[PDB]
Design an enzyme around this catalytic site. Sequence first.
Site, short mmCIF file in Angstrom:
data_model
loop_
_atom_site.label_atom_id
_atom_site.label_comp_id
_atom_site.label_asym_id
_atom_site.label_seq_id
_atom_site.Cartn_x
_atom_site.Cartn_y
_atom_site.Cartn_z
N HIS A 62 0.79 -1.24 0.00
CA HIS A 62 0.00 0.00 0.00
C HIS A 62 0.82 1.30 0.00
CE1 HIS A 62 0.15 0.10 4.53
NE2 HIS A 62 0.11 -1.21 4.37
N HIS A 92 6.79 7.03 5.56
CA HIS A 92 6.17 6.62 4.30
C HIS A 92 5.47 7.82 3.68
CE1 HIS A 92 2.89 6.10 7.31
NE2 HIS A 92 2.15 6.67 6.38
N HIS A 94 2.17 9.22 0.82
CA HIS A 94 0.88 8.99 0.19
C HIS A 94 1.02 9.93 -1.01
CE1 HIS A 94 -0.88 7.16 3.90
NE2 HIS A 94 -0.12 8.01 4.58
N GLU A 104 -3.23 13.60 2.03
CA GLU A 104 -4.38 13.14 2.79
C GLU A 104 -5.02 14.38 3.44
OE1 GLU A 104 -2.76 9.55 5.08
OE2 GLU A 104 -4.04 8.67 3.55
N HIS A 117 4.75 11.09 6.05
CA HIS A 117 4.37 10.81 7.42
C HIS A 117 5.53 10.18 8.17
CE1 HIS A 117 -0.11 10.45 6.22
NE2 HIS A 117 0.26 11.72 6.36
N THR A 196 -4.41 6.71 9.26
CA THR A 196 -5.25 6.90 8.09
C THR A 196 -5.47 5.64 7.24
OG1 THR A 196 -3.43 7.67 6.72
CG2 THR A 196 -4.64 9.32 8.02
C1 LIG Z 1 -0.81 -0.44 12.33
C2 LIG Z 1 0.55 -1.18 12.22
C3 LIG Z 1 1.19 -0.92 10.85
N1 LIG Z 1 0.56 0.37 10.26
C4 LIG Z 1 1.23 1.55 10.72
O1 LIG Z 1 2.18 1.44 11.49
C5 LIG Z 1 0.80 2.78 10.26
C6 LIG Z 1 1.46 3.94 10.68
C7 LIG Z 1 1.06 5.22 10.23
C8 LIG Z 1 -0.02 5.38 9.32
S1 LIG Z 1 -0.38 6.82 8.87
N2 LIG Z 1 -0.57 6.89 7.38
O2 LIG Z 1 -1.58 7.28 9.55
O3 LIG Z 1 0.69 7.69 9.21
C9 LIG Z 1 -0.71 4.20 8.87
C10 LIG Z 1 -0.30 2.91 9.34
C11 LIG Z 1 0.34 -2.72 12.36
N3 LIG Z 1 -0.24 -3.05 13.65
C12 LIG Z 1 -1.55 -2.96 13.95
C13 LIG Z 1 -1.74 -3.39 15.35
C14 LIG Z 1 -0.53 -3.69 15.76
C15 LIG Z 1 -0.08 -4.16 17.01
C16 LIG Z 1 1.30 -4.42 17.21
C17 LIG Z 1 2.23 -4.21 16.16
C18 LIG Z 1 1.77 -3.74 14.91
C19 LIG Z 1 0.40 -3.48 14.70
ZN LIG Z 2 0.72 7.70 6.24
#
Ligand SMILES: C[C@H](CNC(=O)c1ccc(S(N)(=O)=O)cc1)Cn1ccc2ccccc21
Ligand SMILES: [Zn+2]
EC number: 4.2.1.1
Length: 258
Positions: A62, A92, A94, A104, A117, A196
């Site tokens: 993604h 990362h 977008h 975003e 981000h 997001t």
């Molecule tokens: C979300 C996590 C992986 N996703 C992200 O880290 C993440 C960070 C920032 C954005 S953004 N675009 O808002 O900045 C989007 C996604 C996986 N994950 C989910 C639960 C979880 C628990 C332990 C370890 C990893 C875990």
């Molecule tokens: Zn992001």
Amino acid sequence: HHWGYGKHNGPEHWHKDFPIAKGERQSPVDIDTHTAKYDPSLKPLSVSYDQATSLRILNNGHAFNVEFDDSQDKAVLKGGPLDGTYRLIQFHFHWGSLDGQGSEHTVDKKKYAAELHLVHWNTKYGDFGKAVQQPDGLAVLGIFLKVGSAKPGLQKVVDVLDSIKTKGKSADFTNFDPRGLLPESLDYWTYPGSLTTPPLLECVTWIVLKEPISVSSEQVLKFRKLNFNGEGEPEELMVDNWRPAQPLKNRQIKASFK
Ligand SMILES: C[C@H](CNC(=O)c1ccc(S(N)(=O)=O)cc1)Cn1ccc2ccccc21
Ligand SMILES: [Zn+2]
Ligand SMILES: [Hg+2]
């Protein structure tokens, strides 16, 4: 079948598997500059990335993430609307299929070409997984990208994209300095929000920088050559991996400048 940014699994379908999508503190949001409240008690941001250790770049289906060693307080964010220390774990972007879209967050409805981000987690929680179970577990620094002149410091990221073209591929990415991605001024807007992308956890203090960075047409073009798909599958270009602005609801956007 698994989320994405396409017609059949895009942002408008996310709520079916992730009910929090229609939550009370969802991101991104539109920043109405005339409505943000200048809060003089907000302190200046403190970005300390001099000892940052990058390790790997990965295409996760993604977006592409550049990961850092967060086992110690190497690169941290303090100050501003934050209490405590937050460690950088990854960054990362977008971006869009066209220069007039990709960010975003929007400023007075204006969309930028892309958005960076920098994701940090509150050290008080021990690890990232624990931090995402708290309302103040994450702090994400957002930076807008405008198309114009090249950004020297982004070129190293651009060059290696060829080796991580498809979902699942990664490449060793050492010695990258994230300080080269910062604008001149640290003036910002802040509000409480969420991740997001799924799981869309409402655990984020958003710090969006007023000043965008410029990148060349050629630089953003290379982002657009990545694939959502894995090696062997039919090709789907990785473009428009952004979520539309969400309702502000009962929240206020504070500004550190007037
Ligand atoms: C979300 C996590 C992986 N996703 C992200 O880290 C993440 C960070 C920032 C954005 S953004 N675009 O808002 O900045 C989007 C996604 C996986 N994950 C989910 C639960 C979880 C628990 C332990 C370890 C990893 C875990
Ligand atoms: Zn992001
Ligand atoms: Hg949370």
